[PDB]
Amino acid sequence: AKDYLIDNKQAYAKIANTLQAGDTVILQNGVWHDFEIVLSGQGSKQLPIRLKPQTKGKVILSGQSNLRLAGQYLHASGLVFKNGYTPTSAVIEFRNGKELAFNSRVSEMVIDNYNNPDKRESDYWVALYGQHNRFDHNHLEGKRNKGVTVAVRLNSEQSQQNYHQIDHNYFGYRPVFGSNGGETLRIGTSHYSLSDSHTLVENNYFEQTNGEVEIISIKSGKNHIRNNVFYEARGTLTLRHGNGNIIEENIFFGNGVEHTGGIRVINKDHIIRNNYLEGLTGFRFGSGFTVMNGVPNSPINRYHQVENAQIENNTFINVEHIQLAAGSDAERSAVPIDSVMNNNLIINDSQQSFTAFDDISGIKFSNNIANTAVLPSLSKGVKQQQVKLKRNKAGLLYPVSESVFAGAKADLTVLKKADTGVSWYPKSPAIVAFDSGKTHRVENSAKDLLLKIEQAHSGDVLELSAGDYDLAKLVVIDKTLSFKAAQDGAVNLTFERSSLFEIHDGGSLKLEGLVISGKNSPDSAGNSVIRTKKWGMVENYRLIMERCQLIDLDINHTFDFFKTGKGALADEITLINNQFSQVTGDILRLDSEIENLGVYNAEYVTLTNNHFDNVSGALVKLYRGGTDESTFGPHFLLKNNTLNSVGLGKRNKTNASVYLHGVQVTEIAENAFTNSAPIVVEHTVGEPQTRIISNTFTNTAKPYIEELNIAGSHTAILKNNQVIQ
Template sequence: MKLSLFTIAAAALAVAPAHAETLRAADAAQLAAASARAKPGDTIVLADGVWRDAQLVVEARGTAAAPITVTAQTRGKVILSGASNLRIGGEHLVVAGLVFRDGYSPTKEVIALRRDSKTVASNVRLTEIVIDRFNQPDRRAEDIWVALYGADNRVDHSWFAGKGNAGVTLAVIRPKGDARENRHRIDHNYFGPRPPLGSNGGETIRIGTSHESLSNSRTVVEQNLFERCDGEVEIISVKSGANIIRENLIVESQGSIVLRHGNGNIVERNVIRGNGKPHTGGIRIINRDQIVRGNYIERVAGTDFTSAIAVMNGVPNSPINRYHQVANAVIENNSIIDSARITLGAGADAERSAPPVASRFAGNLIRSTLDPFRFDGDASGISFAGNMSSFNPPAQVAGGVTRSTKDFAATKGGLLYLPGSTAGAPQDLVPLKRADAGPSWYPKVVASAPFKGGRDVAVAPGALEQAVRAAGAGDTLRLAPGTYRVATPIAITRPLTIFGPADARISFAAPTLFQLGEGGSLKLDGVSISGSAAPRTPGNAIVRAAPRSTIANYTVMLDNVTVADLASPGFDVIATTPATFADRIDVRLSRFSNITGAIVAAAAERGKDGLYPAELVRITKSRIADVGRIVDVARLGTDESTFGPAVEITDNDVTGGGTPAVRLSGVQSATITGNGFARAGVIDVAHSVGFPVTNIRCNRLTGTPAPRLAKLYAQGSPVVTLDTPATEATCATRS
């Protein structure tokens, strides 16, 4: 049952001693003084208003019968902004109703349940707390929004969304050498959109680290809503033992619940709905004695590590930070509906060579038009019994999976089941109601398209810069025919579309035409752009990402655009920059000629931590002549915690240009199909770790060398499809 602040306060008064006081504070110093004075049953009321650059400390000791409460005067109207944070030490405290917004923590934690390393919190409740896009200025700077130290603490009915810099949203901290049981409870919270980070370190919840992972935490994560939490491959990362993850609702979130380290965890009665979104996953199983039961997983599109169910191979005699062998896993009575993959022996390679043993896959219900099972390694250590499917099961599970041709029905909660069968998730399972997560007074995020919802604005030649400065988010600037001469870079700080006929010609005399800033995204539609007047200096670009780190991810789209005469050295069309991240760079139906640089230069990140600058780079149905490079995309290092980058180059006509024509390094998904390459440079692909997928097929190569592939590291299993005489014949038939 959800409790308002007023209910909390009333309950506190009901059990408070007759001499309980109400103390008031209007700044950090007054709060510290009130905390030092507070006795069991007292309430400290924080004055409404903006508390800027407020580093708050609460250290007090209540009792179980009479906790000390620290609360906003009016829920949601105490705003912590600027360089602000909160540290809590002591026991039997309730902290409620605060909002962190328009700032960032000056330390590594926004809220820490410890005063210092010697004064940790126990029996502390954080309720109806909001942390809204409270990010470090540099997306690579790491912090934790809520760090749970100590034991028996609770975080409930709170709101966390928009984390754009590195670091876990909420973490249970189990320091090395401290193997205590934590017994925290994390419930009824709203974990809203977290955009792809573009590197490791983007988990939404993490329980422990590898150091003490073989000891138990006993933390419970239940009845939370996770919506579009896309930070990295692990949404909930379990790195300790005896935890319970139950009755959560996960919606359109890229990644999985991952039992990464630790033994004896239970994942039960969760509802996971991918809605077909790429890379949405289910539950990944590693280590011993894990129980995965009664979960409902529908339309998740992930494969390999993010399959609906992924049972991993382990490393023999594994170091504490690698992959312990799966043993005694119980996977039972789960419903896996219309999902892409069930992977057994996931990650099997020369290092991860220990298959699952003594494990059971029983009573599960699987609906799919095609067989979703994939065996990446030896699955003989998994027994199968009592499973039902809508497809003909593979030979490896013969006798343990039975096909049914019955129609499925829906429960009152809207979940599918097979009438007359006990297989699958329990029919009394009901997805968490959206209204039951987070504080009722703070709205949940509504998805919006970046280039829609604004005004249509007519623009005449000579007025482009002024129109951009006056534009609002989502506006479309419609250019009249004529020449638009631009002398200085145009700053783009909000989503904006510039639309015009082909005879709306933009000529610029600056090193950059459009300079993206924080919050900026750009769509160019129909216009013609010439770089002939740009300075003859190296490194020019038409669209350039922000020069400094940005938190908001950006999008660049070129649709039916003509670009010519970028003749100075290294003149790019779209140039990414370090510490910025594009959700999408999308080019279609456009024409490019006489360009010395790249259409998409996305190799700006040079670190070895798996950083990369764009999730998706796509060029399709365009004509490309005498261009130095079509795309240059790099992801360096050996980290496996992200999905991208993905590159799609399809149905283009390419003539001439530099070599290599395409350069991809560490790209996780590459599709280069249906293109014509005449007298062009080589396609150069270097594979990294994980399971990169490269599909180079049905291209017409005239006076162009065959693609060149390399493998950067010994580990990793790239999946490569290249044209052969047989596939070339198939391509010719289809053309």
């Protein structure tokens, strides 16, 4: 057995096929392009076959590179995957075709934004096959395309009963995906969900894993999830399919962040104990704790009745929603049975949680303690009592009184973020913050403006001097940038191309105090002031505009203010205290996802204190089609705005000043609609939360609300609105 220092791919190929126990392959420092590594051979427990770098952190794999393991007692470690994407189904794969890896290990890997350029082209970053493999001390962040980040596969007997160990990994940022398929960890699939996987998932740190409602999707039997930390993670740990899973000693720090969930319970024989859940704001199936209703004789890929669930000795601090018998309907009529809830501590500094949606007499309650009037009908199983808490040195709240025998065990440990991932690669912020950089004064000229844009760094601010800026070119925004007027109302912008700003990957845009006119824009349909890349967007973006005036967007028809590209997704679009006048198109066109697969173009949309005058199109066309219930948004807020002659354009097929199809949270308050088209809400699935309050409708038809997946009356809240004809 020998050490092989490998300096190029052909040198690797010369030896890759004859590796023997004890061999170690050392990749020379640098960037390797289009390197499809296969580590294979018959190692032994005393003499494994090793692959490692010359220097940890200096071997980068880019382009269409990946890694495959096949054989026994193999250990790959220390590689960095960035600036590329796998040309196969996975970046790291514990197999080589039909040949699987056993008793093998992958550690100290970094995969950082190693994304397929097509968000709809699905892939895994890590795919486990075989048995008795380990995936530890790795660092994964920034997966943006369809497909779970880490998948334990069970599509053969030699991949089931694996007892894989997934420990001490840093599962970093995953942005909101805006679609199903954004999980971080999946154990099995429905087809193989009746097999036992026995996968151990321990001591991992999940931070802002916000892909979708399922952070972890367990779809197999007898797995063990313990001592993991979920920090401001939007989603839940869902026992989706399979029976006999053990969830214990996990820690959820929501910090009141929106849509932070906990544990959802489906299927049979699960044990949920000694978990600590704090500050979780998610609701419905993304709630802090859910026990679902099942389907009688359920198909394998639907919902199986909860039976023999043992939920004991858990602590719930300011968890806003606990739901039992959830999802009850004509299909999901099977209520939980033969289950128990014991020794749980439920403390809500405020007052919110706990709701039953069906018969819950199949859940026996004992020695549960709460500070609110949680369960008055289950009187003897839940006791109301004021519990004063003290946060210990580990960061956990415990009762100050030693006579409170409820909640998680006293010695519960808390995994440290610094004990996961690797010490030689930084754990950096998910996003570049607006205005976090330097401010550059810009001369009154389009040339100097374009120059300062080109030379600015992400997070910088461009303070424009007074005067005109007549752009002849498209302004690309591929970094986080803010544009601000030295003095409000003293800066005018015009543009000759079909658009002024085009937001690319990495771009985020903030505008303040500007006047923008389309008076020099092309005499053609389809103009816009701001747009994303028409196709192929990968990174979520932010758009903020405050105290701006947009005028004369009317040289031709279909002159929008903002137009989404296909597949694009905004983390937020925020328009505060702006003036829009004389627009032939729409203001916010977020309606490109016509396939009705559950894809949408904006997570948060917020319009406040604006004035809209003579807009032929709608304020917003926000569309999410289909019957998917895996996501949180879109969210729409419209408050304290004024609309005059909005939405009556002959070309506005929605016939609405505000068109909301599939939007999941809607707040329309304290607006004035005058001589405008009405609000049109089209509710789909997921029991959307729509609220229309204290608005005035002068010469404007009352809101129209339609249920497309539910019978009878609509579920929106309409309160204190005035219709004046």
